[PDB]
Amino acid sequence: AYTPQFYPGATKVAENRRNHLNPNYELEKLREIPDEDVVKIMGHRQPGEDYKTVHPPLEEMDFVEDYARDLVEPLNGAKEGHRVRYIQFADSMYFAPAQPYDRSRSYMSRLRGVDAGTLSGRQVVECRESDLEEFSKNILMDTELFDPATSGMRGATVHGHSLRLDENGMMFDALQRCVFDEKTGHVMYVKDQVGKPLDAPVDVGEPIPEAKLREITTIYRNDGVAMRADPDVIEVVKRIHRARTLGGYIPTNETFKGL
Amino acid sequence: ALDYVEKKYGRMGTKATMDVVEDVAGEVTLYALEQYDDYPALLEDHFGGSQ
Amino acid sequence: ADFSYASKHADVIQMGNALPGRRARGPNEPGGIRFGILSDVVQTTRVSED
Amino acid sequence: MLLLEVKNVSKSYGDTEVLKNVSFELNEGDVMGVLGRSGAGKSVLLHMLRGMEGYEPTSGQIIYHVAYCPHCENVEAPSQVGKKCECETEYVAKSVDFWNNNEITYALKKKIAIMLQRTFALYGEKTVAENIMEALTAAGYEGKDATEWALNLIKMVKLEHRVAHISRDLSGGEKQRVVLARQIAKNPVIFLADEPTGTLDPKTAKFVHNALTEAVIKHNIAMVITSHWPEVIEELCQKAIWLDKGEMRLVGESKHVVEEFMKTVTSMKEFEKVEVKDELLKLENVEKRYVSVDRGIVKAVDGIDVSINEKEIFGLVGVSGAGKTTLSKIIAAVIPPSKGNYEFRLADEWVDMTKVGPLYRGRAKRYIGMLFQEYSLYPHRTILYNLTESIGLEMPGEFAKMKAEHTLVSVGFTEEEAENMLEKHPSELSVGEKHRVALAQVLIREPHLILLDEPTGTMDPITRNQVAESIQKSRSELDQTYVIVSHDMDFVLNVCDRAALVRGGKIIKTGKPDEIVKILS
Amino acid sequence: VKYEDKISLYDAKGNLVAENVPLEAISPLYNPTIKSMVKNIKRTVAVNLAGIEGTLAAGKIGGKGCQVPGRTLDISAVSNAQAIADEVEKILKVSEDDDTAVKIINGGKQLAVQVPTARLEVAAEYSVSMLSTAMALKEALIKTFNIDMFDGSTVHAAIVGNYPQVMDYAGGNIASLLGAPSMMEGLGYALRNIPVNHAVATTKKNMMNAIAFSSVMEQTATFEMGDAVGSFERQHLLGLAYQGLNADNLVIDFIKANAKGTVGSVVETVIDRAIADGVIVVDKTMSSGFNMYKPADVNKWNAYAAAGLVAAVAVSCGAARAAQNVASVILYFNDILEYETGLPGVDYGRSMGTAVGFSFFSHSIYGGGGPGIFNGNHVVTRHSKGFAIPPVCAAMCADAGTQMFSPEHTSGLVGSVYSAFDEFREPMKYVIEGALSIKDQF
Amino acid sequence: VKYEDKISLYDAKGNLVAENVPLEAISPLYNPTIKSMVKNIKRTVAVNLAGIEGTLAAGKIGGKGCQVPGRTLDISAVSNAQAIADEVEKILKVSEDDDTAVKIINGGKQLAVQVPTARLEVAAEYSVSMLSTAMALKEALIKTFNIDMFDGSTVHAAIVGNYPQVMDYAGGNIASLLGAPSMMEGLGYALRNIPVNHAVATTKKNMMNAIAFSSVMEQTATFEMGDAVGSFERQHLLGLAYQGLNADNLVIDFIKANAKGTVGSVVETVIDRAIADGVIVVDKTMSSGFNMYKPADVNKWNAYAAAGLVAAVAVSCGAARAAQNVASVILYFNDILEYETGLPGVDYGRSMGTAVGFSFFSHSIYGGGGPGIFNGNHVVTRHSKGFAIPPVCAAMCADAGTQMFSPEHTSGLVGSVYSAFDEFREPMKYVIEGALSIKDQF
Amino acid sequence: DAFALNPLVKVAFADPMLVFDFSKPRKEIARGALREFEAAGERDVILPAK
Amino acid sequence: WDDIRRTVIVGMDTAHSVLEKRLGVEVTPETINEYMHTINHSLPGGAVVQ
Amino acid sequence: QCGASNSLAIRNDEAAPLELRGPNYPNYAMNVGHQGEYAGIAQAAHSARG
Ligand SMILES: Nc1ncnc2c1ncn2[C@@H]1O[C@H](COP(=O)(O)OP(=O)(O)OP(=O)(O)O)[C@@H](O)[C@H]1O
Ligand SMILES: Nc1ncnc2c1ncn2[C@@H]1O[C@H](COP(=O)(O)OP(=O)(O)OP(=O)(O)O)[C@@H](O)[C@H]1O
Ligand SMILES: C[C@H](OP(=O)(O)O)[C@H](NC(=O)/C=C\CCCCSSCCS(=O)(=O)O)C(=O)O
Ligand SMILES: C[C@@H](OP(=O)(O)O)[C@H](NC(=O)CCCCCCS)C(=O)O
Ligand SMILES: [Mg+2]
Ligand SMILES: [Zn+2]
């Protein structure tokens, strides 16, 4: 067979990117947020009530006979028939453990039937509501992919990914969805990801210490680990660029001899 | 970029090949991103990633 | 995206159409305005019966 | 003549004979009743007859005998063998054997209708008309034909007040009737109905029932209907089976069978009296209006003044669409009112609750738990995870297992059943086992005010009496106040004490459940 | 012969059809089936008689919201139908053994007219079909119901709609699969006008057949653009064979291997297959592991990556049963493959750029419409030369009715007209048969 | 078959060829020569090799007065024209007997290529020829002279001027008889986009051959636009036969009868011939004595008036030997014919109005120019459906050098390339032969 | 008739908030000829006064 | 000419239907008034709460 | 993404020198943040040569 490498490089940032891309790597969990708390921060549905449906279950609807379409097993939320919801994250440039393109690549490498979108200060994944809640609790919130200070589940107004951290080390939030409770040392979400206030604040845990954030981040920084210390990634990027250029010029084997 | 080019190539000291494009563009990109990392004022001025 | 189509690409009424060829112009230019549209622009039927 | 046979089939699920020695025969037109306890195997048997994934037999087989066009893939009734197609060809008779990959299976599967238990197979965003219109167009008909039916149909399940209304914003039994009206409108060879009426009130249930007859029995479409609630099995089926834990305890004329079943039964436990203690909630002019620029105003709650007196069980009875779920969601601080006051006496202070936040509604919302009429669990988690880790239990994980077992036992499971159920997924339970698990999930946090939107609906009289004594014991030993929305009257007589009647968003009169009964009749 | 590449042809069920088929047997310049589809698309016109009747009855000539009082004609086009079709056929007739075919669709409310190839042999462009059909229909309507001489302009406005003022058929009831040649994004872009929904509705929501239709049109268009000329012809032929026609059963094999899998598992299976077939080899191993990969056959590696792209879209959109995932799957399939192997993606980044285009076009308020209206004659989607559009057909075929731009909403007339032709309803089978008919001439 | 009126056939010298030829024998839908002309006009591309060498040597890419310093390539394309043509033929070849011809013109200075028909069968339009020729030329220049990878962009800019930015071929050294589809002013106007200077230079300034070329192209275009279908077809067939092919030798006889005459003498000759042939009869005699005339055959009177219009243009512009008189002659031939007979003009006054606008835009500040730059796609000369452009071609053939924008100034590459083919240069003697080939099939 | 080609164009240009009122086109051209028509699109607030 | 050039008529019935059904947002006359206030602030050059 | 392939391409729709490229270049006809800097790179090509 083929043993899959995931990312070039020898530094800790490349190792963290490889770990995020690896579906067989168990991400270290750092907090326990209950399922109903994740649902409440998500703000899509009331916990305890049934999922809203967009179509009948796949057994009820009649489709044409398609051999290639029926080879793929659908998701459970697709089997019952559920609306497609989203969960959106903002990641600070100051050593957040997960980063937008890294998030999108890891989501599309690890999860089935997801819709990943990458912006500079935004990253959103869309899926059926039950499966989306499942991997939001299991992977997105409780593991080392999330830090309540340098990252945040937020839709609507997103700003502060490139700004400096506040006095408590948290990312800037124009709507202030999550605040810092100095009596317990924990970050508490007082609003959901879109902005309406929550009736009961939910503990997402305490901020990750900066020393651990240096080890678990996936961003390259001059004050942390720079790409000049990782020449293998730059060489792979340059090889990809040269291969694209040679393929766009003349896509033959003799023109790729100068690769 | 001009200083780095004049120190090792010159203004018209090299013929356009792949290697000089990779070297110059990679060095200038690494410098610009290092300056964004080193100076929070520069990063907060160009807050959007597209900029 | 579906709402964007429904809100700004579903029932848009433009004053004039784009013109082709050597008279190349965009929409809402006076070469694209039909005679009936311009008749509807003028409001004299509102205030006069002659 | 004969439609389908059932050979000696024993369905097992890992040393779990959900069903064994099941065999019955049906002809072209007859209603067959499947009567039994909760978890007896009725939903498994209907998914078995439907041919859904995971319901393949381990021992036996079922034969479907149909008509068929080899050029058109239309399946029909076997009686059509001898008649003329809607295409060329005459017809051919096929002994489709399900679970044998017999082509026709696909066409036959399209020709059979199923009413899923506690699952609304509707498009949600396609209103009421387009949902039914879809059914017609999908199955065939034509502009006029469809229109005629659509209107004639919306009349039968009684939905003329919600025609352009979005079906996602409907209310429980209304969605049930919408799914029903979608389910007649396909011309099936068989209509498998799992709990066709639902937790529906007497009157609306009667309309559903007559609609079913008006249609399926007219087109001599065989009926397989389950209800572990007999009075329908009799008024609908002529030949009914009684099974107990997957084994046919009897196979007879429906009348004798229902008799025998009802003898096996138990009466209620009329608990001891209780004195209540002070007012806890006070709602003053609560209104809830759903205004649309395209369908009119739906005044769900139309000015409602109620008071609950603390440790007491309060009932809310009414007809479908009266506004009980909207009211209960207003009480649980889930849906804000358009107008009106709600104060909750935490201990002596009345927090104004139409104000969001921990400083205001939150205060009382820590001790408010709601079981929804359209409930759900977490299907990717186990039952033990659902009671303990999914909601957050304030105890170490080693000691949460016996707490969840105690809660399941208090709900009305045995020790063996609760032990076997803990390491299981919600998809492996029955509708009624999932309902009791959701009730336990509400109860296990021990909130003060508990709202229970239709606790019963799929419980044998015995299971229902169980859930009932549960609520009564917890109210007295734990002074828990309850608000109950229900349709079973005898539950209100032997459980509730100060029920209220809801009619079109009003409160009419509040009083004793017997007084409410003589007001109703 | 000039290409030594041999392919094995498979059907839509994954069964073998023939082996050692030459690569040029599926070429648009050789395949008779592809020629027949091109000619049929060029000469087929769809006429909405019910729309003409409704427009003339209410005086709804013009465009959106346009209505001329007093210019209302009460004719019965649907009731007559057969007489109008006979008159149109008689006017459009050139020889007696002509290919003129005016058939009646949906009981008189629609017409499917095929103008003869004699009128297209002396035409520099395909627009002769719609103009000739419009003229024949105008004459048939004027002669059948005795229209006054002063209402022929109203009849023309109802049929065609604002044509001398607006160089298009906007408010009319006559349609074709190809738009106006002056409304193309670039020169030679005429064949990239069929949207995804039209291809899905024509193939009756069949996955492989819609993929084959989209790929055949896109690669024939690249031949029309002059792109697949010289050193690019081999790469476009390999792309067509492996992406649309399931050469060597690659798409079916990847889907079967990744039934429970994700996009990354599809990437892994594609890399494993390309290593096993000898398409790619190890270039060098860096200090931190990561043995770099280089293509031993560049065009074959591009074809393998395109087949894997189609399979990844099918796997993800069959898992979700929703057609909204196409942009992310193409984008991050290419990204994961590039940063996993150090190899170029499909179309050397053009597929990834077109996936970014799909992303901003179908996922934002800046976006417009869904993936069902994707066509190569759009500025957003023109950049990939027939490598990003055929996966969108698989995505829309895997959709469980959760899209506003469903094929039923946008392409019912197109499906009812063009599904009657065998080479359009099942393009895969008949393209394979046409390739089999010309095996021995290479 | 459906037209029972026969015509005679005469050559450009006025000698009889055959009699009782059916009218459909010269129809574009039946005549093999017209079909071959349309097929060959879509695949023939004019290449300026000396222009390519001069553009690359001085860096003249960009268009009008555009120079890019630094992007200068020194190649010897005119000397290596044989190798370049061989490589272009190798690239463009489909099979080995395909009608691919790359002939060398003017000692390597020009190149006339013909892309194969099979490349155009699967193309929706005619733009495949120029794009395919551009790509083949780019590859041939890149592999003949070992041009660097960073200068292939300059080679592309030299061959095609600003194509991705300007949807046209303006600054390049490649050309065709037909214009770009983006320049079309209406659908079906692709065959109308041949300027008068191109047709005059193609026929080597022969009057009757240029009349035949322009008439064949314009009436085939009217067939393409759908104008000449149904009851409109006979009028355009007779207009092509009489004005363009001198069926009953009407043009030559009228010119011979008015060798030293004016426009008015041609008008009376036309009326006398139409009366003698029974085409027109006296309707009524008025109180003033004016004889109002009516057509016994409307389309035949149309054809007679069109042939007389061409004859009047030839007479007046051969007397003046200047091509600036076309608009006035076309105006006043119709103007005095209508008020002499009471009969409509050549195209029911659609052609007199074409002359009234031609007289605007050939003598004013507002646009247009010389008569040689106009065409059927022009906004000034599009209104007459094939009845006003062959007079302009005849007048430009009769010009002795009084025009600044002469065919020598405007069409030097196109004329020299397209005059090498016998079918384009002398369309009369081959269209008559094609009619004789199918004379017995009606 | 209330309109000629488009009812939506007829209602839209009946708006009193339009600076040019299309009820009396002859009268306002007179006002613009006598320099008493206050037109829009003037950049007076972003330009120097000298 | 300026008033004709700057006029675009857009229908809001498919947008309201998409908001009510697909987006699950109620459309009331109060919500339409709020939208009209928002577009009246935002159409000339405005940015809402930014 | 399509840039590296289209930068030194020779195909009809993709090849153009950067001096001859513009906002109507098919890759460049949608997005902010590229065109003005493309013009500066085109100038810098000739500023190095003086
Ligand atoms: N997928 C499954 N795997 C294992 N056991 C299952 C599965 N589905 C159902 N069961 C069990 O099989 C038995 C029959 O369940 P079924 O849903 O048929 O009950 P039922 O008779 O319909 O009762 P109810 O009134 O609750 O609907 C129950 O014990 C149930 O827990
Ligand atoms: N979100 C909504 N938008 C509009 N109308 C609604 C909405 N929710 C409920 N309604 C309507 O308001 C009425 C009251 O609904 P509610 O769910 O409170 O009824 P109910 O008394 O619980 O009836 P059931 O017995 O069916 O549960 C119903 O007719 C319902 O269709
Ligand atoms: C301007 C361009 O067309 P053109 O370049 O050919 O003129 C035009 N582009 C668009 O419409 C599309 C999207 C532009 C919006 C991007 C603004 S950047 S700020 C927020 C963007 S994001 O947060 O959602 O990523 C088009 O119609 O294709
Ligand atoms: C003929 C044509 O000019 P060109 O030949 O294309 O330069 C065309 N003229 C016009 O339509 C001028 C319109 C106004 C001038 C005369 C008004 S009576 C134009 O400007 O495009
Ligand atoms: Mg059940
Ligand atoms: Zn049949």
UniProtKB/TrEMBL annotation, chain A:
<dbReference type="GO" id="GO:0015948">
    <property type="term" value="P:methanogenesis"/>
</dbReference>
<dbReference type="GO" id="GO:0005737">
    <property type="term" value="C:cytoplasm"/>
</dbReference>
<dbReference type="GO" id="GO:0050524">
    <property type="term" value="F:coenzyme-B sulfoethylthiotransferase activity"/>
</dbReference>
<keyword id="KW-0808">Transferase</keyword>
<comment type="subunit">
    <text>Hexamer of two alpha, two beta, and two gamma chains.</text>
</comment>
<feature type="binding site">
    <location>
        <position position="120"/>
    </location>
    <ligand>
        <name>coenzyme F430 1</name>
    </ligand>
</feature>
<comment type="pathway">
    <text>One-carbon metabolism; methyl-coenzyme M reduction; methane from methyl-coenzyme M: step 1/1.</text>
</comment>
<feature type="binding site">
    <location>
        <position position="161"/>
    </location>
    <ligand>
        <name>coenzyme F430 2</name>
    </ligand>
</feature>
<protein>
    <recommendedName>
        <fullName>Methyl-coenzyme M reductase subunit gamma</fullName>
        <ecNumber>2.8.4.1</ecNumber>
    </recommendedName>
</protein>
<comment type="subunit">
    <text>MCR is a hexamer of two alpha, two beta, and two gamma chains, forming a dimer of heterotrimers.</text>
</comment>
<feature type="binding site">
    <location>
        <position position="121"/>
    </location>
    <ligand>
        <name>coenzyme F430 1</name>
    </ligand>
</feature>
<comment type="similarity">
    <text>Belongs to the methyl-coenzyme M reductase gamma subunit family.</text>
</comment>
UniProtKB/TrEMBL annotation, chain C:
<comment type="function">
    <text>Component of the methyl-coenzyme M reductase (MCR) I that catalyzes the reductive cleavage of methyl-coenzyme M (CoM-S-CH3 or 2-(methylthio)ethanesulfonate) using coenzyme B (CoB or 7-mercaptoheptanoylthreonine phosphate) as reductant which results in the production of methane and the mixed heterodisulfide of CoB and CoM (CoM-S-S-CoB). This is the final step in methanogenesis.</text>
</comment>
<comment type="similarity">
    <text>Belongs to the methyl-coenzyme M reductase alpha subunit family.</text>
</comment>
<comment type="subunit">
    <text>Hexamer of two alpha, two beta, and two gamma chains.</text>
</comment>
<feature type="binding site">
    <location>
        <position position="22"/>
    </location>
    <ligand>
        <name>coenzyme B</name>
    </ligand>
</feature>
<protein>
    <recommendedName>
        <fullName>Methyl-coenzyme M reductase subunit alpha</fullName>
    </recommendedName>
</protein>
<comment type="subunit">
    <text>MCR is a hexamer of two alpha, two beta, and two gamma chains, forming a dimer of heterotrimers.</text>
</comment>
<feature type="binding site">
    <location>
        <position position="8"/>
    </location>
    <ligand>
        <name>coenzyme B</name>
    </ligand>
</feature>
<feature type="modified residue" description="5-methylarginine">
    <location>
        <position position="23"/>
    </location>
</feature>
<feature type="modified residue" description="Pros-methylhistidine">
    <location>
        <position position="9"/>
    </location>
</feature>
TrEMBL record, chain D:
<keyword id="KW-0862">Zinc</keyword>
<feature type="domain" description="ABC transporter">
    <location>
        <begin position="281"/>
        <end position="521"/>
    </location>
</feature>
<feature type="binding site">
    <location>
        <position position="41"/>
    </location>
    <ligand>
        <name>ATP 1</name>
    </ligand>
</feature>
<feature type="domain" description="ABC transporter">
    <location>
        <begin position="4"/>
        <end position="270"/>
    </location>
</feature>
<keyword id="KW-0479">Metal-binding</keyword>
<feature type="binding site">
    <location>
        <position position="86"/>
    </location>
    <ligand>
        <name>Zn(2+)</name>
    </ligand>
</feature>
<feature type="binding site">
    <location>
        <position position="326"/>
    </location>
    <ligand>
        <name>ATP 2</name>
    </ligand>
</feature>
<feature type="binding site">
    <location>
        <position position="117"/>
    </location>
    <ligand>
        <name>Mg(2+) 1</name>
    </ligand>
</feature>
<dbReference type="InterPro" id="IPR017871">
    <property type="entry name" value="ABC_transporter-like_CS"/>
</dbReference>
<feature type="binding site">
    <location>
        <position position="323"/>
    </location>
    <ligand>
        <name>ATP 2</name>
    </ligand>
</feature>
<feature type="binding site">
    <location>
        <position position="44"/>
    </location>
    <ligand>
        <name>ATP 1</name>
    </ligand>
</feature>
<dbReference type="GO" id="GO:0005524">
    <property type="term" value="F:ATP binding"/>
</dbReference>
TrEMBL record, chains E, F:
<dbReference type="InterPro" id="IPR003179">
    <property type="entry name" value="Me_CoM_Rdtase_bsu"/>
</dbReference>
<feature type="binding site">
    <location>
        <position position="366"/>
    </location>
    <ligand>
        <name>coenzyme F430 2</name>
    </ligand>
</feature>
<dbReference type="InterPro" id="IPR009024">
    <property type="entry name" value="Me_CoM_Rdtase_Fd-like_fold"/>
</dbReference>
<dbReference type="InterPro" id="IPR022679">
    <property type="entry name" value="Me_CoM_Rdtase_bsu_C"/>
</dbReference>
<comment type="subunit">
    <text>Hexamer of two alpha, two beta, and two gamma chains.</text>
</comment>
<keyword id="KW-0808">Transferase</keyword>
<comment type="similarity">
    <text>Belongs to the methyl-coenzyme M reductase beta subunit family.</text>
</comment>
<comment type="subunit">
    <text>MCR is a hexamer of two alpha, two beta, and two gamma chains, forming a dimer of heterotrimers.</text>
</comment>
<protein>
    <recommendedName>
        <fullName>Methyl-coenzyme M reductase subunit beta</fullName>
        <ecNumber>2.8.4.1</ecNumber>
    </recommendedName>
</protein>
<dbReference type="InterPro" id="IPR022680">
    <property type="entry name" value="Me_CoM_Rdtase_bsu_N"/>
</dbReference>
<dbReference type="InterPro" id="IPR015823">
    <property type="entry name" value="Me_CoM_Rdtase_asu_N_sub2"/>
</dbReference>
<dbReference type="GO" id="GO:0050524">
    <property type="term" value="F:coenzyme-B sulfoethylthiotransferase activity"/>
</dbReference>
